[PDB]
Design an enzyme around this catalytic site. Structure first.
Site, short mmCIF file in Angstrom:
data_model
loop_
_atom_site.label_atom_id
_atom_site.label_comp_id
_atom_site.label_asym_id
_atom_site.label_seq_id
_atom_site.Cartn_x
_atom_site.Cartn_y
_atom_site.Cartn_z
N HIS A 114 8.58 28.50 4.62
CA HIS A 114 8.34 27.50 3.76
C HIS A 114 8.61 28.34 2.24
CE1 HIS A 114 6.98 24.00 2.01
NE2 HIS A 114 6.13 24.67 1.04
N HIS A 156 1.87 15.68 -5.94
CA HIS A 156 3.00 16.42 -5.60
C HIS A 156 3.63 15.89 -4.33
CE1 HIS A 156 4.45 19.99 -3.34
NE2 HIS A 156 4.67 20.45 -4.49
N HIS A 162 3.00 13.32 10.47
CA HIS A 162 2.68 12.34 9.45
C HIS A 162 3.50 12.71 8.02
CE1 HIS A 162 -0.32 9.09 8.86
NE2 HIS A 162 -0.52 9.72 7.72
N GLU A 176 4.77 30.31 7.15
CA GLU A 176 4.67 30.83 5.79
C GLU A 176 5.72 31.54 5.18
OE1 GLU A 176 1.45 33.39 6.59
OE2 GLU A 176 0.02 32.03 6.49
C1 HEM Z 1 1.64 3.53 8.20
C2 HEM Z 1 1.38 3.99 6.99
C3 HEM Z 1 0.90 5.28 6.24
C4 HEM Z 1 1.61 6.18 5.15
C5 HEM Z 1 2.92 5.74 4.46
C6 HEM Z 1 0.92 7.37 5.05
C7 HEM Z 1 0.98 8.47 4.03
C8 HEM Z 1 0.39 9.60 3.94
C9 HEM Z 1 0.80 10.67 3.41
C10 HEM Z 1 2.05 10.59 2.16
C11 HEM Z 1 -0.36 11.67 3.30
C12 HEM Z 1 -0.38 12.83 2.54
C13 HEM Z 1 -0.17 14.03 3.24
C14 HEM Z 1 -0.40 15.29 2.68
O1 HEM Z 1 -0.33 15.44 1.14
O2 HEM Z 1 0.01 16.55 3.03
C15 HEM Z 1 -1.26 10.86 4.20
C16 HEM Z 1 -2.35 11.86 4.60
C17 HEM Z 1 -3.43 11.37 5.66
N1 HEM Z 1 -3.31 10.21 6.46
FE1 HEM Z 1 -1.98 8.85 6.19
N2 HEM Z 1 -0.35 7.37 5.74
C18 HEM Z 1 -0.28 6.19 6.60
C19 HEM Z 1 -1.23 5.93 7.52
C20 HEM Z 1 -2.50 6.62 8.20
C21 HEM Z 1 -3.14 6.25 9.14
C22 HEM Z 1 -3.13 4.55 9.95
C23 HEM Z 1 -4.31 7.12 9.24
C24 HEM Z 1 -5.60 7.11 10.19
C25 HEM Z 1 -6.36 6.16 10.74
C26 HEM Z 1 -3.98 8.23 8.28
C27 HEM Z 1 -4.82 9.24 8.06
C28 HEM Z 1 -4.48 10.34 7.27
C29 HEM Z 1 -5.30 11.48 7.02
C30 HEM Z 1 -6.60 11.69 7.89
C31 HEM Z 1 -4.69 12.25 6.26
C32 HEM Z 1 -4.95 13.45 5.37
C33 HEM Z 1 -4.27 14.94 5.99
C34 HEM Z 1 -4.42 16.09 5.57
O3 HEM Z 1 -5.81 16.54 5.22
O4 HEM Z 1 -3.53 16.92 5.60
N3 HEM Z 1 -2.92 7.88 7.58
N4 HEM Z 1 -0.78 9.72 4.61
#
Ligand code: HEM
Ligand SMILES: CCCCCCCC/C=C\CCCCCCCC(=O)OC[C@H](O)CO
Ligand SMILES: CCCCCCCC/C=C\CCCCCCCC(=O)OC[C@H](O)CO
Ligand SMILES: CCCCCCCC/C=C\CCCCCCCC(=O)OC[C@H](O)CO
Ligand SMILES: CCCCCCCC/C=C\CCCCCCCC(=O)OC[C@H](O)CO
Ligand SMILES: CCCCCCCC/C=C\CCCCCCCC(=O)OC[C@H](O)CO
Ligand SMILES: CCCCCCCC/C=C\CCCCCCCC(=O)OC[C@H](O)CO
Ligand SMILES: CCCCCCCC/C=C\CCCCCCCC(=O)OC[C@H](O)CO
Ligand SMILES: CCCCCCCC/C=C\CCCCCCCC(=O)OC[C@H](O)CO
Ligand SMILES: CCCCCCCC/C=C\CCCCCCCC(=O)OC[C@H](O)CO
Ligand SMILES: CCCCCCCC/C=C\CCCCCCCC(=O)OC[C@H](O)CO
Ligand SMILES: CCCCCCCC/C=C\CCCCCCCC(=O)OC[C@H](O)CO
Ligand SMILES: CCCCCCCC/C=C\CCCCCCCC(=O)OC[C@H](O)CO
Ligand SMILES: CCCCCCCC/C=C\CCCCCCCC(=O)OC[C@H](O)CO
Ligand SMILES: CCCCCCCC/C=C\CCCCCCCC(=O)OC[C@H](O)CO
Ligand SMILES: CCCCCCCC/C=C\CCCCCCCC(=O)OC[C@H](O)CO
Ligand SMILES: CCCCCCCC/C=C\CCCCCCCC(=O)OC[C@H](O)CO
Ligand SMILES: CCCCCCCC/C=C\CCCCCCCC(=O)OC[C@H](O)CO
Ligand SMILES: [Cu+2]
EC number: 1.17.99.9
Length: 309
Positions: A66, A129, A284, A63
């Protein structure tokens, strides 16, 4: 190495530092709340401002680190923008567009962040954002790249490559589409649809693995959008492996893209399986930052090639 004023390697150091700080501001957002009154606090315990007695915890460092990175960013970005503009532009005309992009987006994410303290219930706006923060980082990253290339006679990456129309379609198209996938992801987060589907690739054991509720549709839409991006990158990498084997920056640039997309997908699956362990959330945000960086590098190559030819 170079008999020129030693203060020049400091511009390179500032570039590396700022790129790093902007990356921290971006991926660090996966560990702290970005909306509401608990903004800035570890996501698992939104209360870190006020009441608590204890201190020097590993979550308190996150915290502090950041908010510190976010504060110092204004100083660093403005200095980098100005200095690089004064020094690098003679060699790279793109320097000015990047310096400007860096400043504008640093301010936009700061603006959006300020508003998220009180309008964080609007997921459609809050989901903007990350992409803004992502461009803020990518602008500084590419600027720093030009800073290094400017001090080399035989450039390593910023070389006048011949980009065919098809490859240009893939590069620009994937860049734009990745930004879209980035939005759907941010939308999942701010809409709290992260764990609506315990299974992978399908939603859950019920309803045949198909979404039947709001949060399941958001979750599934994100996965579906990600799959298409994954497939497109495979097609783009195959075209590079076949037709650009003689242009290594493009050849390896796409292989790295392929690797980052794979790690992005995997960490995405682990976010779900781990029920949002923040370590996977962090990963991620990081891998998409790497992929987008490479895609922005490709955009610079096209921008220069279209100027040259
Ligand atoms: C490979 C291409 C993918 C890209 C470019 C991508 C991109 C992103 C981005 C930019 C976020 C937002 C994070 C945030 O606002 O802090 C996100 C969230 C998320 N992604 Fe992906 N994603 C991809 C694939 C996946 C896959 C294959 C799954 C699951 C099966 C997944 C599950 C999730 C979940 C559960 C969140 C919400 C996380 C949170 O609550 O902090 N994503 N993703
Ligand atoms: C709180 C701490 C703040 C300070 C943080 C310091 C970060 C130092 C990072 C890089 C130094 C760059 C030195 C540049 C040396 C000039 C020669 C050069 O360009 O080397 C390039 C390299 O091999 C690649 O292509
Ligand atoms: C969809 C979202 C896409 C986001 C891409 C935005 C910024 C990437 C960083 C910049 C990448 C390189 C651009 C170089 C350029 O445009 O140069 C112009 C010209 O020389 C005038 O100074
Ligand atoms: C939405 C934000 C879009 C912001 C786009 C900012 C572009 C700034 C720009 O075009 O600066 C060019 C410069 O003067 C010449 O190289
Ligand atoms: C809300 C802003 C979100 C995306 C705007 C992206 C704008 C990026 C503009 C880049 C222009 C460019 O890449 O010129 C070559
Ligand atoms: C940590 C962030 C480091 C980001 C540094 C980007 C610039 C760079 O690494 O440029 C290398 C190249 O070989 C230059 O000639
Ligand atoms: C194999 C998978 C294929 C998926 C196709 C997706 C369809 C449309 C996306 C279009 C997005 C916008 C792309 C614009 C690209 C562009 O501007 O190409 C310029 C170049 O010089 C000349 O083609
Ligand atoms: C699907 C939603 C938006 C597509 C945006 C497509 C933007 C196409 C830009 C084409 C381009 O950049 O041509 C140079
Ligand atoms: C996009 C939202 C479309 C909302 C309506 C979709 C209805 C539907 O597809 O539900 C079928 C099944 O039980 C599960 O996927
Ligand atoms: C992914 C991007 C947008 C998807 C937005 C999805 C919005 C889904 C709203 C909830 C819904 O459509 O539920 C309908 C029905 O009960 C069951 O299919
Ligand atoms: C011929 C059939 C499809 C061409 C599709 C063109 C884009 C395909 C990218 C993946 C690929 O394998 O490109 C190979 C080659 O250069 C392609 O002309
Ligand atoms: C920092 C911003 C992101 C940059 C990412 C760019 C490319 C990734 C892959 C680079 C792999 C190294 C390529 C070196 C090469 O192509 O050498 C060829 C030869 O000497 C003739 O030019
Ligand atoms: C970090 C993510 C992926 C690593 C990809 C690393 C790819 C670096 C390859 C550099 C290379 O092998 O350059 C070859 C040369 O021009 C001829 O043999
Ligand atoms: C070929 C596409 C395979 C897509 C599978 C996705 C899952 C693996 C993800 C990342 C590893 C990337 C490894 C890429 C290995 C490429 C090997 C190569 O480039 O061989 C070329 C040769 O020298 C000249 O034709
Ligand atoms: C390659 C490295 C792969 C690292 C995979 C980590 C697996 C793991 O430890 O899973 C933990 C999680 O919290 C359980 O759902
Ligand atoms: C310069 C930038 C410096 C940062 C670079 C690394 C950033 C992200 C990689 C994160 C990798 C995460 C690997 C998985 C971690 C994990 O398994 O977390 C599990 C959880 O705590 C329960 O088991
Ligand atoms: C901030 C540091 C991460 C920068 C991420 C951007 C490009 C990764 C290129 C990796 C080299 C591929 C060979
Ligand atoms: C905002 C939507 C797309 C980014 C605009 C940039 C799309 C790529 C344009 C490439 C270009 O024109 O480089 C000079
Ligand atoms: Cu709900």
């Amino acid at each position: 190495h170079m008999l020129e004023d030693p203060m020049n390697k400091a511009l390179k150091a500032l570039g590396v530092l700022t790129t790093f700080v902007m990356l921290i501001v971006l991926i660090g957002g996966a560990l702290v709340t970005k909306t509401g009154s608990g903004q800035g606090c570890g996501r698992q315990w939104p209360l870190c401002h006020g009441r608590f007695f204890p201190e020097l915890n590993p979550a308190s460092i996150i915290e502090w680190s950041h908010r510190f990175a976010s504060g110092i960013s204004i100083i660093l970005v403005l200095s980098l923008a100005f200095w690089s503009w004064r020094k690098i532009t003679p060699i790279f005309r793109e320097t000015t567009f990047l310096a400007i992009m860096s400043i504008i987006f640093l301010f936009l994410q700061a603006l959006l962040g300020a508003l998220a303290v009180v309008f964080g219930s609007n997921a459609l706006i809050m989901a903007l954002h990350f992409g803004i923060s992502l461009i803020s980082f990518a602008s500084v990253l590419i600027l720093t790249l030009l800073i290094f290339e400017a001090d080399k006679s035989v450039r390593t990456l910023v070389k006048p490559l011949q980009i065919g129309k098809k490859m240009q379609f893939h590069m620009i198209g994937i860049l734009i589409y990745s930004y879209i996938v980035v939005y759907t992801g941010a939308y999942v987060r701010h809409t709290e649809s992260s764990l609506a589907c315990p299974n992978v690739p399908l939603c859950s054991p019920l309803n045949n693995g198909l979404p039947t509720q709001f949060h399941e549709w958001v979750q599934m839409g994100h996965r579906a959008a990600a799959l298409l991006l994954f497939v497109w990158i495979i097609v783009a990498a195959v075209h590079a492996i076949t037709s650009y084997k003689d242009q290594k920056q493009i050849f390896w640039g796409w292989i790295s893209c392929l690797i980052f997309i794979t790690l992005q997908a995997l960490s995405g699956i682990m976010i779900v399986y781990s029920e949002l362990a923040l370590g996977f959330a962090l990963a991620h945000s990081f891998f998409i930052a790497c992929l987008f960086g490479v895609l922005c590098y490709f955009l610079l190559l096209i921008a220069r090639f279209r100027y040259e030819s």
